[PDB]
Amino acid sequence: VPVIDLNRVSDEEQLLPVVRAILLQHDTFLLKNYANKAVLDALLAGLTTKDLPDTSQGFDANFTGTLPLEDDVWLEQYIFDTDPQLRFDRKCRNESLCSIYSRLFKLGLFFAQLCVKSVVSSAELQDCISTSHYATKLTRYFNDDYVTFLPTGVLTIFPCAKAIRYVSIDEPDCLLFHTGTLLARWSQGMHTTSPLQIDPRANIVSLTIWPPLTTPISSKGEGTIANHLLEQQIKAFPKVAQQYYPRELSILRLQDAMKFVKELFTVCETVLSLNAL
Amino acid sequence: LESLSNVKANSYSEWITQPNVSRTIARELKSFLLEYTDETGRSVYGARIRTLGEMNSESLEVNYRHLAESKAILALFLAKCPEEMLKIFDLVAMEATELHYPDYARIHSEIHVRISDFPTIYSLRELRESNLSSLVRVTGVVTRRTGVFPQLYRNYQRVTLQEAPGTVPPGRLPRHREVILLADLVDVSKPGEEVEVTGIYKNNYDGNLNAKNGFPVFATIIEANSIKRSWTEEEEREFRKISRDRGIIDKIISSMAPSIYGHRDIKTAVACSLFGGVPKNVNGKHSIRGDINVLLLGDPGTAKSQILKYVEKTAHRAVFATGQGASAVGLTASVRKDPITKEWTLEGGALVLADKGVCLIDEFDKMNDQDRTSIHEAMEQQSISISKAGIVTTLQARCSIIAAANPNGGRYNSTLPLAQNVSLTEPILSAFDILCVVRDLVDEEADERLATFVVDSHVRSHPENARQRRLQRQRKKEEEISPIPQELLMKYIHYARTKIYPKLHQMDMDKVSRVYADLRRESISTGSFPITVRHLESILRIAESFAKMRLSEFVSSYDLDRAIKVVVDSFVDAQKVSVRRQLRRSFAIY
Amino acid sequence: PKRDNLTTLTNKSRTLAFVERAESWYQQVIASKDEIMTDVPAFKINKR
Numbered sequence A: 001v002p003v004i005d006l007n008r009v010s011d012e013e014q015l016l017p018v019v020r021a022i023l024l025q026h027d028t029f030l031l032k033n034y035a036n037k038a039v040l041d042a043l044l045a046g047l048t049t050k051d052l053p054d055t056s057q058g059f060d061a062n063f064t065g066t067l068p069l070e071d072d073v074w075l076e077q078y079i080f081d082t083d084p085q086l087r088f089d090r091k092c093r094n095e096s097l098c099s100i101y102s103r104l105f106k107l108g109l110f111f112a113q114l115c116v117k118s119v120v121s122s123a124e125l126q127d128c129i130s131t132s133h134y135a136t137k138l139t140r141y142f143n144d145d146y147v148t149f150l151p152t153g154v155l156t157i158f159p160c161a162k163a164i165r166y167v168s169i170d171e172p173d174c175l176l177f178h179t180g181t182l183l184a185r186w187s188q189g190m191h192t193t194s195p196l197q198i199d200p201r202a203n204i205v206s207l208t209i210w211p212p213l214t215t216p217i218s219s220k221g222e223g224t225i226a227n228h229l230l231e232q233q234i235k236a237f238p239k240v241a242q243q244y245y246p247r248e249l250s251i252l253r254l255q256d257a258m259k260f261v262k263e264l265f266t267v268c269e270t271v272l273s274l275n276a277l
Numbered sequence B: 001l002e003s004l005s006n007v008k009a010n011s012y013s014e015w016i017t018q019p020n021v022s023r024t025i026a027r028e029l030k031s032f033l034l035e036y037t038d039e040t041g042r043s044v045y046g047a048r049i050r051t052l053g054e055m056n057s058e059s060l061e062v063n064y065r066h067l068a069e070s071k072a073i074l075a076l077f078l079a080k081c082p083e084e085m086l087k088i089f090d091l092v093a094m095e096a097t098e099l100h101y102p103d104y105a106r107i108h109s110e111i112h113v114r115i116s117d118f119p120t121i122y123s124l125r126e127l128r129e130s131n132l133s134s135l136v137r138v139t140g141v142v143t144r145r146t147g148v149f150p151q152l153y154r155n156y157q158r159v160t161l162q163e164a165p166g167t168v169p170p171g172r173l174p175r176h177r178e179v180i181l182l183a184d185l186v187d188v189s190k191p192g193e194e195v196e197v198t199g200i201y202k203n204n205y206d207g208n209l210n211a212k213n214g215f216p217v218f219a220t221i222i223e224a225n226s227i228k229r230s231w232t233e234e235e236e237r238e239f240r241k242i243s244r245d246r247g248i249i250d251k252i253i254s255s256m257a258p259s260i261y262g263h264r265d266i267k268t269a270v271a272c273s274l275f276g277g278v279p280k281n282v283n284g285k286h287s288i289r290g291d292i293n294v295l296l297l298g299d300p301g302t303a304k305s306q307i308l309k310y311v312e313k314t315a316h317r318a319v320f321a322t323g324q325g326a327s328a329v330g331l332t333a334s335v336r337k338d339p340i341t342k343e344w345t346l347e348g349g350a351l352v353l354a355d356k357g358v359c360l361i362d363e364f365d366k367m368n369d370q371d372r373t374s375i376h377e378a379m380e381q382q383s384i385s386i387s388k389a390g391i392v393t394t395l396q397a398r399c400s401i402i403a404a405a406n407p408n409g410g411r412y413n414s415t416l417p418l419a420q421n422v423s424l425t426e427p428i429l430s431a432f433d434i435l436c437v438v439r440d441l442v443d444e445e446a447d448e449r450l451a452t453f454v455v456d457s458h459v460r461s462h463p464e465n466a467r468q469r470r471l472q473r474q475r476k477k478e479e480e481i482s483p484i485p486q487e488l489l490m491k492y493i494h495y496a497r498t499k500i501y502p503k504l505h506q507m508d509m510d511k512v513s514r515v516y517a518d519l520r521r522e523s524i525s526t527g528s529f530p531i532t533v534r535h536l537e538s539i540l541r542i543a544e545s546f547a548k549m550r551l552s553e554f555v556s557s558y559d560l561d562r563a564i565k566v567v568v569d570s571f572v573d574a575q576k577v578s579v580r581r582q583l584r585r586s587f588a589i590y
Numbered sequence C: 001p002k003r004d005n006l007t008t009l010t011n012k013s014r015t016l017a018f019v020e021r022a023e024s025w026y027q028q029v030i031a032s033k034d035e036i037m038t039d040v041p042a043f044k045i046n047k048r
């Protein structure tokens, strides 16, 4: 896994060649020796020993709140977007999470812009992600079989690259940066990504960034980033989707079945051909 | 041009040998090696060539199915005439990788292609005549292996593959074939390994044998192209469900030998020996075995032999032996000549076959001490050491042992210790983990229960989509006598053995050490048998096996309690009658 | 189903036919407003 060290690569003219070399060969890379890492360790200690999640918040159709999972596992998730048209009023209820979020977003935002600049050839999309135009999702597991997920955000950030699988990563002093599918489709086929695997009982905290969700993915249709985020969230949380998005859940579940039969039919041609000869 | 390759007016090999067709598919092969798509994975072979040129590896690995998608008939021609197709695929892979890594020929002259994941699989008894001069995939056991010598130079090696130990039909010796290994594919396996190999099946003993004798004969060999040494989620959907059910350990034990009454201290010993423990090898120190050793000593009857017949069928790799029918050579190793290299070659015995398996020795007492000495060093070192015919080498013999025996005079002397009821010397007795002492003493309470079980066992096993109907009826009878269907248990045990490696918790250190010190204190107090560290080593092993039954990655307190019960009970029951009653009261808690 | 034991012309085309059959049927199903089936329904074998 590629490693980015601020003590060696910190300038834009230093980072941009490295990020492009990473994205054209890898979908996940490490950040090392970040000054805020020491503060994050203390903040994560409070979140695992004193800052118990508020279970009374519940979980809403906006995919925000404290969603209970199997084996009494709790998942605290918040979604925010700078666009006023989306009513993400259910902001984070914990200050320690906000303390980590601000530190991660301070440098991750620049990295997310670098990721877009590295592979997205569109000059219009160079500034699609900014301080006043962004969408972020904060996720935190809690406990009082690995889950496979494919983030759609441009950049996915973890404060600690430990117990994360895709092969396992056991770097306590390095942060984990991952790129989603939205960056891939805007890269004109130059970049693609792979899903990650995490233990839901590991209390992993994660942050993922999108451009504003109302931004259309392409001019060829009505598809927007909000639809792409909704697609991932419905696939990630089918039980919640049934209450609020039943038809979309059925359509998205159908896609996986239609993918299976295409893959199955691909193999079956070879088997019958071999017996024929 | 690709469509033109389909239109064939000659035989499969004849069309390929045409220079225009050969160059046609050479371009077609060259196009694919860089152009492929796997949705998110895209051109995986581009990365495959990238990492191969990074390593300068001679092993050109390819997946079979991928070629058949981009190039439909190109892969099928490779299957029907592997020798002709791989001949030019050598050059195509050379030129295609030189597109990414030029000047590769500056160091390496050839690129031998390694096919992988070939779908069609044959056994050593299915090699029909029609399979000659074709690519085949077979699975077997490495019995005989030759050394490494150059060939007209590049490395050469020769190996024999033998049928699976547990699948040989009655009345036949194990079928086996000679296999030809080429350079870069030497030392891939060692004797006792179970491997699957893909290669070409052909006859190659022509020449000197023709004029050697009248009606001359040849032999069939396999030219090893690529050798390999596996579950699905739908099956794990069943294993995980049962793993957390109530009384999982009791379902397992009660399903050992369904048509055998009682003897639950043996059935629990059989169950633990099937699952086994966790081997450990500390670097720079010695290793620790995980195999569980069981000794069945009892009076005539009591079905000690029938247990070893049930273990033979249920275990994955079971090798059955008898004390008198076996020999020292027939267990450790034998020697064969080989004209290809002219040095002596060694072929393994029964203990080498049962590596990572179970070795059954019926009537263990009747064999001579020289035969018995080999078995002792087999369980201790888990390896075979031999110096015969100028060959000095060591082979892996990691096998579990289940032994049945008889006491002196054919009846167990209840008033004397076990160490004075059999000719088996004490150092050999110490190699066992579980020592079961079965008595046959008359009592109408036990006899009515046992007889009514047996008289129903015979009326059950009496002989007399139809296949599905018969399997359903057999399943019904399996349920009537056992809680778990047998073939499921066979799969269930295999998954636990392969996947689960339960680990210790230091929280249970007090539970283990305190019991040991308490057991040691009573040893000097009463009894002649001194408690040894090997007993504690036995407790941990069976504790790990009990955890492996539940498919839990960590040792629980419940497993230790049952682990303590089995080892203490065997140690108490082997003592003389006067000492036996004192110890039962002292260990009523355990 | 082809009249010959093997034909690459009927291999890619039938694979494309399956893709065309699947993709077109995918668009047909999504037009429904009711709860769309999450899995492909199983074919029923006619009596021989």
Ligand SMILES: Nc1ncnc2c1ncn2[C@@H]1O[C@H](COP(=O)(O)OP(=O)(O)O)[C@@H](O)[C@H]1O
Pocket (backbone or CB within 6 Å): B259, B260, B261, B262, B263, B299, B300, B301, B302, B303, B304, B305, B306, B450, B454
């Ligand atoms: N405890 C038992 N319960 C049921 N049947 C038994 C039992 N012990 C022996 N038998 C019967 O006796 C036969 C086993 O005899 P055998 O294998 O010669 O015992 P051993 O070899 O230990 O002397 C089996 O066919 C079985 O039906």
